[PDB]
């Protein structure tokens, strides 16, 4: 029926109390909803967290808490450890029907900020005789694990190509990731700078090529 | 004790149909509900439907009344979900998780991919561009580009060259995917000794080689 709001993405540190909130848009979240939370732990592992807007264990630590605020229900985590980085899920009941909210996708940081060793790769030789050249741009040991990348060719912005995917993390814990610029020879043989430069928080590494 | 070991992953063409089996163990069969629910790529979870071992009586979102059919196998204690007509949208990983007063534990989940075609990749070295070494260490990589299926494998000279060795995410391109794979090393190590990238395509009985050599 309605639609369950949930916070995107939220990050925090141990020690620390965070609160998700989970909207419905019909109203006043009561029992007849039957508020239910789960966990999902990234190997997209699913774990019932909350239940009956109240009831807790099925071993589920005392430091997580639901609640039912007014128009929404909310999970409270007061203590926050770095295991309880998640993706937390509420679910509201509207008859006959079960909606579950967009998740809150919870950063517990837990490491040092680490940066960003990005290498540029330019187009190999048997490729570009396929008429396509495909520029890449590795990411790698970078903490916390969220880089925006973004490319110019001779100066020039590109809204093309651009393939980044989602950062993958390493045995180290620090993430890993790259940015593809697929184009054909003909653009490629048109340029002369190809520049790839990440984003990790306030600071853009940039990372060029001037292949003629 | 409680286990939903759930079935193994499913790839099919459209118009096909796929029918998941949840088995449980851990729990009493009879006392709780099970629910199908479908997480799709990005739009997250989704309620499809659950059965009522307790009256025998299955439960449909409408959105889905057409498309799957819960049914339960009591004699194994194992709940079945049935989905017909499959398409692209249908494409995800579906959950089987128990009732009580939430959805307490859950199934290990089971992927079901609908689509087109097969391919290996085509793979493409990377090799610095005439740079050289500024730790005395040098990145070369591969391009394992346009396959189908996934997934891709990736080793660094036979899996002797373990450290240093980044494996990327593959991407959908042309509607086939692309991946990724670096290996850091000495200066010394490369061109002298060789350096080799073993990629593993599984669906095409692939495992292709890609020398690096200095442009
Ligand atoms: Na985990
Ligand atoms: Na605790
Ligand atoms: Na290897
Ligand atoms: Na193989
Ligand atoms: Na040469």
């Known amino acids: 029926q309605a639609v369950v709001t949930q916070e995107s993405a939220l990050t925090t540190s141990p020690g620390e109390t965070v609160t998700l909130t989970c909207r419905s848009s019909?109203?006043?979240?009561?029992?007849?909803?039957?508020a239910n939370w789960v966990q999902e732990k990234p190997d997209h592992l699913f774990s019932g967290l909350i239940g009956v807007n109240n009831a807790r264990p099925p071993g589920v630590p005392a430091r997580f808490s639901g609640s039912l605020t007014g128009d929404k229900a909310v999970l409270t985590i007061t203590g926050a450890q770095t295991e309880d980085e998640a993706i937390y899920f509420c679910?509201?009941?509207?008859?006959?029907?079960?909606?579950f909210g967009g998740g809150t996708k919870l950063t517990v940081l837990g490491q040092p900020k680490s940066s960003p060793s990005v290498t540029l790769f330019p187009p190999s030789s048997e490729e570009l005789e396929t008429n396509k050249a495909t520029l890449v741009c590795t990411i790698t040991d970078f903490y916390p694990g969220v880089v925006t990348v973004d490319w110019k060719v001779d100066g020039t912005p590109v809204t093309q190509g651009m393939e980044t995917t989602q950062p993958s993390k390493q045995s180290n814990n620090k993430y890993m990731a790259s940015s593809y610029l697929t184009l054909t020879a003909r653009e490629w043989e048109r340029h002369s700078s190809y520049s790839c430069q990440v984003t990790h928080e306030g600071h853009t590494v940039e990372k060029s090529l001037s292949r003629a | 004790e409680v286990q939903l070991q759930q079935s193994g992953p499913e790839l099919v063409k459209p118009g096909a149909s796929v029918k998941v089996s949840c088995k449980a163990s851990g729990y009493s069969f009879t006392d709780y509900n099970m629910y199908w629910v479908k997480q799709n790529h990005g739009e997250s979870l989704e309620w499809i439907a659950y059965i009522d071992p307790s009256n025998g009586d299955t439960f449909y979102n409408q959105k889905f009344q057409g498309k799957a059919t819960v049914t339960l196998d009591k004699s194994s204690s194992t709940a079945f979900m049935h989905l017909n007509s499959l398409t692209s949208e249908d494409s995800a990983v579906y959950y089987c998780?128990?009732?009580?007063?939430?959805?307490?534990?859950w199934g290990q989940g089971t992927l079901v991919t609908v689509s087109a075609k097969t391919t290996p990749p085509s793979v493409y070295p990377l090799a610095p561009g005439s740079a050289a070494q500024t730790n005395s260490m040098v990145t070369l990589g591969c391009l394992v580009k346009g396959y189908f299926p996934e997934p891709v494998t990736v080793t660094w000279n036979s899996g002797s060259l373990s450290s240093g060795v980044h494996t990327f995410p593959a991407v959908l391109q042309s509607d086939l995917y692309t991946l990724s794979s670096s290996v850091t090393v000495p200066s010394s190590p490369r061109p002298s000794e060789t350096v080799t990238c073993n990629v593993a395509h599984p669906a095409s009985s692939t495992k292709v080689d890609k020398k690096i050599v200095p442009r």
């Open positions: 679910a509201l009941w509207y008859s006959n029907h079960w909606v």
């Open positions: 998780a128990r009732g009580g007063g939430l959805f307490a534990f």
């Open positions: 019909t109203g006043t979240i009561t029992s007849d909803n039957y």
